[PDB]
Amino acid sequence: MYRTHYSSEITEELNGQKVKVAGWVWEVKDLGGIKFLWIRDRDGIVQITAPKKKVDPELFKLIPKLRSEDVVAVEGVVNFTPKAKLGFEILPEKIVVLNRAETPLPLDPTGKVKAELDTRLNNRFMDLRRPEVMAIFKIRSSVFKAVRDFFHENGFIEIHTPKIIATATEGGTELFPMKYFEEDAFLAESPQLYKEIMMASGLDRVYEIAPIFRAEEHNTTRHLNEAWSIDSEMAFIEDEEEVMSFLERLVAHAINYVREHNAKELDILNFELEEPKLPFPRVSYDKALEILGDLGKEIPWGEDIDTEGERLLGKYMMENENAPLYFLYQYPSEAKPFYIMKYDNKPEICRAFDLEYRGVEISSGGQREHRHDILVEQIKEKGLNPESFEFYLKAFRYGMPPHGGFGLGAERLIKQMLDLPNIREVILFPRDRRRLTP
Amino acid sequence: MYRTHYSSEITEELNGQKVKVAGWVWEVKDLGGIKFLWIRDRDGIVQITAPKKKVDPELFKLIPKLRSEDVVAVEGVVNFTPKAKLGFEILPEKIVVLNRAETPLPLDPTGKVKAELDTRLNNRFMDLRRPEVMAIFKIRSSVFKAVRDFFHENGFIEIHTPKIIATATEGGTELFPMKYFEEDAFLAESPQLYKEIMMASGLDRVYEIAPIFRAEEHNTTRHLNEAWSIDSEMAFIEDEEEVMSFLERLVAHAINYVREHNAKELDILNFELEEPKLPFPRVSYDKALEILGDLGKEIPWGEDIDTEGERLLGKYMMENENAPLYFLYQYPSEAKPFYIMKYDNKPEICRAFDLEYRGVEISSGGQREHRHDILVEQIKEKGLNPESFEFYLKAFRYGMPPHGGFGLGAERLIKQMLDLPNIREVILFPRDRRRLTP
Ligand SMILES: Nc1ncnc2c1ncn2[C@@H]1O[C@H](COP(=O)(O)OP(=O)(O)OP(=O)(O)O)[C@@H](O)[C@H]1O
Ligand SMILES: Nc1ncnc2c1ncn2[C@@H]1O[C@H](COP(=O)(O)OP(=O)(O)OP(=O)(O)O)[C@@H](O)[C@H]1O
Ligand SMILES: [Mn+2]
Numbered sequence: 066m067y068r069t070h071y072s073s074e075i076t077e078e079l080n081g082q083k084v085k086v087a088g089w090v091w092e093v094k095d096l097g098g099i100k101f102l103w104i105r106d107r108d109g110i111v112q113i114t115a116p117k118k119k120v121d122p123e124l125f126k127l128i129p130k131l132r133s134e135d136v137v138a139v140e141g142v143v144n145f146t147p148k149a150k151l152g153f154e155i156l157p158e159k160i161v162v163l164n165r166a167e168t169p170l171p172l173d174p175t176g177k178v179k180a181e182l183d184t185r186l187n188n189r190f191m192d193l194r195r196p197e198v199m200a201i202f203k204i205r206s207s208v209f210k211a212v213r214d215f216f217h218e219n220g221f222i223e224i225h226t227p228k229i230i231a232t233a234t235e236g237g238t239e240l241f242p243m244k245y246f247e248e249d250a251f252l253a254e255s256p257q258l259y260k261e262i263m264m265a266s267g268l269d270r271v272y273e274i275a276p277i278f279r280a281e282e283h284n285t286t287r288h289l290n291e292a293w294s295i296d297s298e299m300a301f302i303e304d305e306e307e308v309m310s311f312l313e314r315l316v317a318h319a320i321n322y323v324r325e326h327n328a329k330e331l332d333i334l335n336f337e338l339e340e341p342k343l344p345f346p347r348v349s350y351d352k353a354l355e356i357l358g359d360l361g362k363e364i365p366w367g368e369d370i371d372t373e374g375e376r377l378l379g380k381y382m383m384e385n386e387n388a389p390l391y392f393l394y395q396y397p398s399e400a401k402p403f404y405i406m407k408y409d410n411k412p413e414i415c416r417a418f419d420l421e422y423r424g425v426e427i428s429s430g431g432q433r434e435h436r437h438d439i440l441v442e443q444i445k446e447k448g449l450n451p452e453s454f455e456f457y458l459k460a461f462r463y464g465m466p467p468h469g470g471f472g473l474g475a476e477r478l479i480k481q482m483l484d485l486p487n488i489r490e491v492i493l494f495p496r497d498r499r500r501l502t503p
Numbered sequence: 504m505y506r507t508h509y510s511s512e513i514t515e516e517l518n519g520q521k522v523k524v525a526g527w528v529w530e531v532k533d534l535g536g537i538k539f540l541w542i543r544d545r546d547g548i549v550q551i552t553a554p555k556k557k558v559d560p561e562l563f564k565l566i567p568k569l570r571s572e573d574v575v576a577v578e579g580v581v582n583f584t585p586k587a588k589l590g591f592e593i594l595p596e597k598i599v600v601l602n603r604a605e606t607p608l609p610l611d612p613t614g615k616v617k618a619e620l621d622t623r624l625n626n627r628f629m630d631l632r633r634p635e636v637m638a639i640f641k642i643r644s645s646v647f648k649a650v651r652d653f654f655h656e657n658g659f660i661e662i663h664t665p666k667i668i669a670t671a672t673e674g675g676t677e678l679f680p681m682k683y684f685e686e687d688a689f690l691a692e693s694p695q696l697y698k699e700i701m702m703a704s705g706l707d708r709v710y711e712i713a714p715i716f717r718a719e720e721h722n723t724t725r726h727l728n729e730a731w732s733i734d735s736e737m738a739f740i741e742d743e744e745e746v747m748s749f750l751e752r753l754v755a756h757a758i759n760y761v762r763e764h765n766a767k768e769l770d771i772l773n774f775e776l777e778e779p780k781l782p783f784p785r786v787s788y789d790k791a792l793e794i795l796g797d798l799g800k801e802i803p804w805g806e807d808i809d810t811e812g813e814r815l816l817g818k819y820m821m822e823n824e825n826a827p828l829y830f831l832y833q834y835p836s837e838a839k840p841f842y843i844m845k846y847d848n849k850p851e852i853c854r855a856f857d858l859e860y861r862g863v864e865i866s867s868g869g870q871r872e873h874r875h876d877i878l879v880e881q882i883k884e885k886g887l888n889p890e891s892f893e894f895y896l897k898a899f900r901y902g903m904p905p906h907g908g909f910g911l912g913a914e915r916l917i918k919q920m921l922d923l924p925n926i927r928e929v930i931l932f933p934r935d936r937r938r939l940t941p
């Protein structure tokens with residue numbers, strides 16, 4: 066390996082020892098009798114100091130020949146000194162140019178010349194050389210880890226369901242059709258039917274973190290046609306609040322992990338990520354519509370709350386409850402899927418919920434209707450053909466425990482967590498109405 | 504929740520305490536002065552003991568009405584006693600029937616009546632109720648966790664790349680073409696191009712665990728048309744041996760995690776999983792051809808080792824070195840992808856390798872050709888058009904360090920680890936030439 070330590074792994078204990086650092090040339094200053102080389106790696110910049118009387122003459126002449134973004138490797142002695150901005154410098158014994166960069170660069174890694182989003186996406190390898198972008202992807206990886214750790218700690222087993230499928234769906238829209246040899250298939254939009262089927266297996270507590278594909282009609286700063294969904298389904302619940310309780314703790318865990326493990330990144334983003342306050346407020350759909358009405362926003366009882374409505378509610382909840390996160394629940398049964406269980410005592414409302422983060426939905430879920438005959442009737446109430454869901458319905462006939470779950474969008478979670486304007490900032494290679502490359 | 508404890512969570516410590524267990528009716532013994540009920544959850548069976556003198560009369564009359572696979576929940580008192588074959592029994596206070604099972608069952612959960620693989624795959628929710636099948640999926644989840652933990656402990660950052668691609672066409676057949684609105688696109692067979700593009704970003708050490716899609720020409724016991732690939736790419740390496748060293752440690756870690764945390768599942772499977780012995784043997788392609796030739800198996804230099812060659816070599820490696828895992832490396836350059844670096848001093852050989860587990864490939868990798876101009880010539884040598892790779896090639900022009908990586912099949916790893924005859928046993932809903940549904 067061309068390096069022994071990253072910029073962040075050199076501590077005082079190594080003072081006076083030989084180390085190897087490597088990365089991209091950030092800056093070179095030839096100041097006559099002394100020269101400086103700064104190398105940038107994933108964690109920061111390291112200073113290479115070359116006093117004329119202390120380095121090999123060949124090294125002294127090589128430095129000024131180095132160019133921005135050249136990939137280099139340096140072997141030298143660690144010297145902790147107040148004179149070094151970051152606390153220590155490396156006195157070089159050897160400098161190897163591994164690969165030279167061409168010029169001009171596609172994007173300005175110094176951040177001085179700003180680039181439009183599309184140019185940045187077309188050149189992601191350059192984009193991540195900027196600390197504020199690398200910060201987002203480091204945080205994305207931490208969020209995925211925190212989520213899986215929480216699931217594991219809570220007895221959940223990871224499962225994997227098919228993305229190439231040929232079964233019915235409730236909406237029949239936004240599908241990506243594909244030929245599967247002589248048969249017709251589609252890319253999966255959610256593992257919903259499959260995770261429910263597995264509730265009849267004894268697994269009981271499952272999660273899956275995998276891509277979902279939806280051919281969204283038009284672009285928005287909140288949707289992508291390819292995204293990563295964090296799905297869970299859990300059995301033997303007594304109501305949907307047990308699912309909401311689990312979800313909020315999972316989300317709080319992810320937020321706290323980022324706050325604990327990625328403070329450096331949040332600082333680079335000049336962002337103060339709030340300590341979660343559980344339980345999050347619960348706002349019934351009825352109450353949400355009343356609040357929107359007073360704001361001049363009309364939603365007829367029975368219809369889903371639109372994006373403007375969510376935005377207005379998010380602001381209202383921040384102003385009135387200092388709550389960046391809150392649940393909308395007890396939705397009209399007519400506004401949610403046929404697989405959601407209705408309140409037996411008040412059928413017009415159902416056990417579904419949406420978790421809103423800064424006024425944008427990050428997750429949808431609820432308790433499912435596990436009683437076969439009622440489920441079948443609900444399919445009919447949606448004007449659909451139960452026979453088209455036979456492979457799924459069969460799983461409810463041989464001992465199906467009550468269950469519930471949610472789908473939590475990873476990009477949605479991260480975008481809202483960091484209060485970013487566009488979802489394209491949180492996935493490396495976005496897919497939207499017109500973007501298919503890189 | 505309807506349960507507080509799984510069958511495996513009840514210990515001496517809880518003797519005399521009240522708990523709630525829940526699961527599927529496994530057996531009922533209906534006697535005049537006592538009823539016994541056994542229920543099954545994902546970890547095992549729990550005995551419920553109901554003497555007439557001790558339980559509520561309604562509960563006593565309820566038990567005989569229960570039927571196999573009905574879902575029930577039981578609240579009662581833990582009672583340890585040598586008279587209970589499993590060590591303890593639950594003296595029930597309340598029993599609730601959550602859902603009733605129809606008969607006949609799609610599959611026999613008692614294991615007495617065997618069913619063919621196709622029938623089991625069609626009724627996966629029933630199939631996992633058998634301990635030996637549940638065991639496989641618990642181990643699958645364990646392997647995924649171990650792999651991710653190892654990546655994290657070694658400084659790798661998780662990334663996520665597109666499964667819908669314009670082209671890359673780093674090959675010809677075996678691709679699933681798909682329309683992306685007006686454009687022609689394909690399902691990704693590997694994140695190869697993307698993880699390489701990210702080696703120019705500073706991330707340096709990345710991994711991705713995600714679906715891959717391949718329209719395999721032939722139906723085999725070792726291939727699927729949809730699989731999960733564990734991919735990694737790492738920068739600043741000096742040769743492919745650094746990648747092989749990392750990979751063997753990753754696989755050893757996964758194996759040891761299973762041996763340590765799934766001993767119970769390994770026992771249910773009547774399988775002894777060996778302790779990994781590092782380093783695994785490294786066998787050059789030339790040496791493999793010599794071993795095979797000595798055995799009467801002739802492989803013309805330059806051709807890949809076929810399935811029988813792999814089987815013979817795997818057997819030889821066990822006999823000669825008690826090595827169920829070993830590497831094949833220094834393959835002919837003509838036999839590997841354009842992105843593999845050739846030995847500059849012996850160009851007909853390249854820095855690619857395959858990891859074999861019980862005579863079956865579980866992973867391929869190598870050091871890549873990070874030098875732009877040479878890479879372009881190799882694209883040409885493979886009969887491909889460099890212009891089809893502009894977004895990828897662009898990443899090699901602005902400071903690209905040397906790098907290498909591998910693709911490790913999750914199903915391949917698990918199938919081989921457990922010495923299972925068919926890869927369909929290790930993924931819930933397989934996709935092959937003739938199976939598209941469920
Ligand atoms: N096109 C998309 N891009 C990114 N994430 C998505 C997309 N569609 C859904 N999700 C995520 O998956 C979660 C569950 O999916 P669900 O089908 O309930 O979403 P939805 O109600 O269609 O979302 P929306 O109202 O935002 O379009 C959503 O809360 C969101 O986090
Ligand atoms: N159809 C498949 N089903 C399952 N896993 C696969 C499949 N194709 C490839 N893999 C896994 O991905 C790894 C990397 O893919 P690669 O393209 O090197 O495979 P391959 O050499 O074509 O495999 P094989 O020779 O078995 O067909 C393989 O080592 C294997 O573990
Ligand atoms: Mn939607």
Ligand SMILES: [Mn+2]
Nearest residue numbers: 369419426429
């Ligand atoms: Mn929604």
Ligand SMILES: [Mn+2]
Nearest residue numbers: 419426428429
């Ligand atoms: Mn929703």
Ligand SMILES: [Mn+2]
Nearest residue numbers: 677717719726
């Ligand atoms: Mn193949």
Ligand SMILES: [Mn+2]
Nearest residue numbers: 807857864867
């Ligand atoms: Mn192969």
Ligand SMILES: [Mn+2]
Nearest residue numbers: 857864866867
């Ligand atoms: Mn291979």
